[PDB]
Amino acid sequence: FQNFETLQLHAGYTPDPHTRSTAVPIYATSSYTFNDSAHGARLFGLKELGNIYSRLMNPTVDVFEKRIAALEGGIAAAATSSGQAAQFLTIATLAKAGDNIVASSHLYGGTYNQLNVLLPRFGIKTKFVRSGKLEDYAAAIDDQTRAIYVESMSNPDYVVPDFEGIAKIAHEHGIPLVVDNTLGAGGYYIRPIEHGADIVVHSATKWIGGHGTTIGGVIVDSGRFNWNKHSDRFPEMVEPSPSYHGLKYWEAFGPATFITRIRVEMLRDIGACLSPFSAQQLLLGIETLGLRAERHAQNTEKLSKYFESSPNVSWVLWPGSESHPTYSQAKKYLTRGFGAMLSIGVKGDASAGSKVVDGLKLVSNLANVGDAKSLAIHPWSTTGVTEDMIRISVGIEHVDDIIADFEQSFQKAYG
Amino acid sequence: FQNFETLQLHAGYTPDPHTRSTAVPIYATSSYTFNDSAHGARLFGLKELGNIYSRLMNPTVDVFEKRIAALEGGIAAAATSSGQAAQFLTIATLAKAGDNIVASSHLYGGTYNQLNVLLPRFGIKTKFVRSGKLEDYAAAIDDQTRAIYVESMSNPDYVVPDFEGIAKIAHEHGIPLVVDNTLGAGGYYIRPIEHGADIVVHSATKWIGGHGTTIGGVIVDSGRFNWNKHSDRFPEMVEPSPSYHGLKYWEAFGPATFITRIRVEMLRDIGACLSPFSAQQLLLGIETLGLRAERHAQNTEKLSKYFESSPNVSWVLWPGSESHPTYSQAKKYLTRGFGAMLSIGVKGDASAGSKVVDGLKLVSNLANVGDAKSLAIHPWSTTHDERLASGVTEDMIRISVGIEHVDDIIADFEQSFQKAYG
């Protein structure tokens, strides 16, 4: 099972011999009963792997974590209640007051809020790099830096970073590369770990879940970053831990040190855990992830062709276009479809964008991306942003109906 | 309504005219479709109230929030993914790097981890007060303190704080009193807002949910802390916000300032949100909260009497007992039953505690509390000297008394006693 299409259905689960349930049960339980007191000792002492408490782990969530880990080619994963929480728990494990991270400036608005407003209240500052130039990432790094953070394809301008060059800059300064791969659709479009990323985060809310039913995040550990080698920047990864009678994580867990700490420390103490109900919804999504991503990208390519030749369209941003500023990176790293998104500029005054979105009858006007239903938004008049710009999350409806919906909306706004 | 038993079925929900659904629907949606672009702008610009995105709000969760606020007598509440998250979001809203909080030392271990290990990494330190004395709370406060934090009833020793005296100290120092009222059962046993608490947090995982199916937390805002009067310690409550283009929270939201910031800043940026499936589980729990807490407390009282007359028991720790160190506070603040917990010391060597628990066949052996099923643990040999500071002893069994028939609970301990002592 190299194949994503098979992993998305089978990885991380085998029917338990008690029930032999073919589908993944929903373990709607807070707790798990000890076999005896000494069993509980070993569980709480981390002396034995087992279910302790659903704030930390849950057999349903475990399948979701293992399956996403398998699809990204990581060693293991930890689920969170949202993508924001996946980002926050990651940075809070890597950095502490006085530390900083180096981040692309091309960010999801919620992530910018985190990096620019929330984390500085905890003494964690971010140096933003706008240029994408390796030299600029390198120059931003100082002795207090704890990560380079980039999105695998930014939103709504679809900048694809030089994963390999940036990973090397990070590794050569002793810090991990963290990649928000939400727009890589769970490893279908982009696999950052294959290109040097140490940690991958996702908003499972989007393409991973695929049906807009469920908020969720996930942190995937590549297992590839040597915390011992870089204990000068990450002493909590190796030094005796205040929370587990001096447990030394690296000594105990090796390549899983980071993701184990996420679970036994950060899930335990911040508590941004994922419901097993949410997990099951996401698993149903993941079972078709490859098929959906495949059709999403195919529809997106055709929609970009439609918008190129529309007399009402000023411009098109699509990472597959040769004119796109970071096309050589998209070409290099997106070999299974150029994602599910495009952005367009419409002709006319400032109200044109909103008229075109408001006139859509199939495409929905809302915040989300990565739903099976097509979504659009006029981001400046509502929520790389320009007032002619419409951002479009292309769904898996029949392409002719998506196109027709924009056609009738254009006819109404432009006669 | 005034009555807890009616509120827990009705507060915060009216059937929508579309479906007229009598029970609360599960809004298994991440998103909510705009009426138009201008509508989307007003929602995102906080110029209009309405559903935007389930990381921040959700009509199922909204019922859960409003119902818990009504039960506690707060103005509003915000749900979180867990009890820990409720505590964490609360402290992170009150304090930032270089600030501190003063807390009782009688703390849930996960809370102690937050205050002693996790938050200090973010420059947020805690001064612990062990004595319960008002003067020690007062002396621990300094100009960087941002809250006093206590549990309404600690565990496993069931210390009840002097809510009113502590709230007075806090309010004189210009800081809120934050109370973890998990062991007050949703406001059935203990009602800290009635006694000066400004912010109440819960592990809804426990008695609120009541069935051990669901992790969840909730933050309840009393609405009673005047952030403007105390803006010298809380400038972010009154000053123009960087998050929302200079939005001044107190000016816009007044008494809802804290809980509004929890939602529009902390749920939004930390993302520890509660699933609608979880909120629905919790709502089924809440619909019987009064009935369960009542039986819990009645069983717990009867079990205290059974244990205090058992030859096998060295001692009983129960907040309803006049010999309890903080009984005067328990008598004042717990008038609807003295809780659902107790602790006992068993006679014999150090293995007697783990043998009595291991020998239980009805009561379950696990670390959770606040299930309808009875639970017991020997914390010394399991979750936990450093143990002694925590209030844990070799001989202590901690019991979360369920709502089973108390005769069956007693029979279960009796046959385990017979097996451990002959």
From Swiss-Prot, chain A:
GO biological process: cysteine biosynthetic process from serine; L-homocysteine biosynthetic process; transsulfuration
Domain of life: Eukaryota
Pathway annotation: Mycotoxin biosynthesis
The entry's keywords: Pyridoxal phosphate, Transferase
Transmembrane segments: none
GO molecular function: cysteine synthase activity; O-acetylhomoserine aminocarboxypropyltransferase activity; pyridoxal phosphate binding
Cofactor(s) needed for function: pyridoxal 5'-phosphate
Enzyme class, spelled out: transferase
UniProt-listed SUPFAM superfamilies: PLP-dependent transferases
Protein's job: Sulfhydrylase; part of the gene cluster that mediates the biosynthesis of fusaric acid, a mycotoxin with low to moderate toxicity to animals and humans, but with high phytotoxic properties. L-aspartate is suggested as fusaric acid amino acid precursor that is activated and further processed to O-acetyl-L-homoserine by cluster enzymes aspartate kinase FUB3 and homoserine O-acetyltransferase FUB5, as well as enzymes of the primary metabolism.
NCBIfam families, per the entry: OAH_OAS_sulfhy
Xref: PANTHER family: HOMOCYSTEINE/CYSTEINE SYNTHASE, HOMOCYSTEINE_CYSTEINE SYNTHASE
Name listed for the protein in its UniProt record: Sulfhydrylase FUB7
Organism for this UniProt entry: Gibberella fujikuroi (strain CBS 195.34 / IMI 58289 / NRRL A-6831)
